[PDB]
């Protein structure tokens, strides 16, 4: 007895409806009482109750959420999705052998947006310790797909880069990225120009921000 969720990922625009499926490999329905619940977990928060016993809505939950189902298939519906509805949804069986479904990652579809790029030179404190890291922020852009190319005095660099991506913004549904080029203090002193280049679908011409170690 396992719970099969569908789909694994679910892209949906604003104002659109979303439907998540959950199938219990073996009957767990005593329509009596059926203990099937839906839980949500947003990045940085603990999981939280949305719907219990198939269709009962929990306190403080928008009426845009609703549950239904019969036999082995249960469904969660989100009428008119909104920016704050992103996260991972899980169906859970409370009876015989409590089990979590694989979950579904709800993501919002929206208009394209170019990233805001900011670049920063190594701090003096880090330089003292013998290191030199160049940081570059590419914030609030869309779609998520994006690439960062580093330049040291014009020539491309590929070894020693560290990238990280934030989860979709729950307000403007955009994504942001951070890229750190780490060099030794010596390596950083042998060059003057450092460029952070971003190639995104909102252009065929990359967005560039750079600086010279000689200011």
């Amino acid at each position: 007895v396992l719970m099969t969720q569908t789909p694994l990922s679910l892209p949906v625009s604003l104002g659109d409806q979303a439907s998540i499926s959950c199938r219990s490999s073996q009957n767990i329905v005593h329509s009596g009482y059926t203990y099937l619940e839906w839980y949500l977990q947003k990045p940085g928060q603990s999981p939280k109750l949305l719907i219990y016993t198939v269709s009962n809505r929990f306190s403080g939950v928008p009426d845009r959420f609703s549950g239904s189902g019969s036999g082995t298939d249960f469904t969660l519906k989100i009428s008119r999705v909104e920016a704050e509805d992103l996260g991972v949804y899980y169906c859970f069986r409370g009876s015989h052998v409590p089990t979590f479904g694989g979950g579904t990652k709800l993501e919002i579809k929206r208009a394209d947006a170019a990233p805001t790029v900011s670049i920063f030179p190594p701090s003096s404190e880090q330089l003292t310790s013998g290191g030199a890291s160049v940081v570059c922020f590419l914030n609030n852009f869309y779609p998520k797909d994006i690439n960062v190319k580093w330049k040291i005095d014009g020539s491309e660099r590929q070894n020693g880069v560290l990238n990280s991506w934030t989860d979709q913004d729950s307000k403007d549904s955009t994504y942001s990225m951070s890229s750190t080029l780490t060099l030794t203090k010596d390596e950083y002193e042998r060059h003057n120009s450092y460029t952070c280049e971003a190639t995104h679908k909102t252009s065929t011409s990359p967005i560039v921000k750079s600086f010279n170690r000689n200011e």
């Binding site: 603990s46 999981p47 109750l49 979590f100 890291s133 990280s164 750190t180």
Partner: protein, 217 residues
Amino acid sequence: EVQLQQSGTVLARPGASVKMSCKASGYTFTNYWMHWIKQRPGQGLEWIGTIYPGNSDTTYSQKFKGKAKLTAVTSTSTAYMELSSLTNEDSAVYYCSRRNYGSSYAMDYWGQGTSVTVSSAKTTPPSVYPLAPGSNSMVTLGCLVKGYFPEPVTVTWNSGSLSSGVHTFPAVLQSDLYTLSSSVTVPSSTWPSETVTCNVAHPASSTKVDKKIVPRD
């Protein structure tokens, strides 16, 4: 007001054991089942087992029998879970929850979770570096947090009084040493006319670091 307080982060080496707690309040601790859930990135939520504080009756998931041990102390309304023979796959966040009945039939109240890192690497306090623009109508600043272990690390600006336009990025592991960053966007009319400080907390090593961002040159 129902509350479930879990213990802090824990760093244990392979083959060792750990024991976390879940302190309850705001209701009769002995009348409800307490559940434990495992949360490992790229693995969704997983059911460990449950216990009835009243008589300590338990039920474990077949997958966790012999890996987890549930217990409870009714005199302090605290439930505990123990994990032995730790491997890398045991690293994750563990939550506890209360099974309700009557008004609702599900897990309505959860704890804040407990992070567990199974590794033999040494603990290292975070190095926090200020990020000021070198050389618009809004300015973006940041803080580079490097070389710490284990995770997690929490970040705030102006102790929290500043929450808008903030971007804190996930920590990336690179050879026994984590790295993360955080940007904050504010009106040019407020910086450096006013102060901006990033607060970094690393419970795992019992330290705190503050860094004031000041104009360069």
